Amino acid sequence: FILLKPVFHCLNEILDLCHSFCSLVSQNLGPLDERGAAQLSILVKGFSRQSSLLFKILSSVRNHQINSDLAQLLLRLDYNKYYTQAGGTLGSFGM
């Protein structure tokens, strides 16, 4: 997907959000403080939005029949249809 500039940029933003989330989790050894909890909520919203964007991208490509492999990756992600049941948004992290 290196060639899919908008998809590549969205994926890069998702990866950076994941890195920031991992950093936030690593900084808090115990339960998240109010700042850590706020960061976690922001990360959850970002991740759900980015995964919804990913699902929208996959559906747009399906409409354009542009890439089978992206559909395969989406199928692998939604194997239990959880993301499909979640509408392609990354499942709400239960706090």
Partner: protein, 60 residues
Amino acid sequence: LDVLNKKYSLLDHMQAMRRYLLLGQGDFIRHLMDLLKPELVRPATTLYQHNLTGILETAV
């Protein structure tokens, strides 16, 4: 004609059209329709192309 047959399988492509695209493989169409029934009953806005392609490959 020899080139079309050997390199582009024009007659073979037509036979394929008959078997599949002309629904000559009627059992395949039946099984596909049976699998699609739970999907084709759903609202069209809820269809995922990936799922339909996977069902098609499975039926094949």
